């Protein structure tokens, strides 16, 4: 399983979206998720660059400023 | 709602996670969700710039790509 479209649809709604396809949701879903899988796996080999210290905030924070370009 | 850390759990498990820290899960969720709201009002001011109602896999497509990733 992966990014539920209901949660997202409320995010996008939170912006001020009104009427959204599930396909709009899922492309965003597959974006933000593959991004999330992106940062995380970054933050993973990050914590793995350590070798051990659990996935952590700065493990994200590094991971994010990492992959992003 | 702010990207539940369970769902992001199995995402970042897909990454390669084992034992995360709540600082981690939330920070990422704070990242991507900040982005997701971004692509929203983008895809939205997109679908409104059109003069239409329904946001699509396109509307994400232009919103997201318009950003970068």
UniProtKB/Swiss-Prot annotation, chains A, B:
PANTHER family: ARCHAEAL HISTONE A. NCBIfam families: archaea_histone. InterPro entries: Archaeal_histone_HMF, CBFA_NFYB_domain, Histone-fold, HmfB-like. It is found in: Cytoplasm; Chromosome. One of its GO terms (cellular component) is chromosome. This is DNA-binding protein HMf-2. Its main location: cytoplasm. Homodimer and heterodimer of HmfA and HmfB. Heterodimers may be formed primarily when cells enter stationary growth. Dimers then assemble into higher oligomers, with the DNA wrapped around the protein core. Higher order oligomerization of these structures can give rise to long, superhelical fibers (in vitro).
């Amino acid at each position: 399983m992966e990014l539920p479209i209901a949660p997202i649809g409320r995010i996008i709604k939170d912006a001020g979206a009104e009427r959204v396809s599930d396909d709009a949701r899922i492309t965003l879903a597959k974006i933000l998720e593959e991004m999330g899988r992106d940062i995380a796996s970054e933050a993973i080999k990050l914590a793995r660059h350590a070798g051990r210290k659990t996935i952590k905030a700065e493990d994200i924070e590094l991971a994010v400023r990492r992959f992003k370009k």
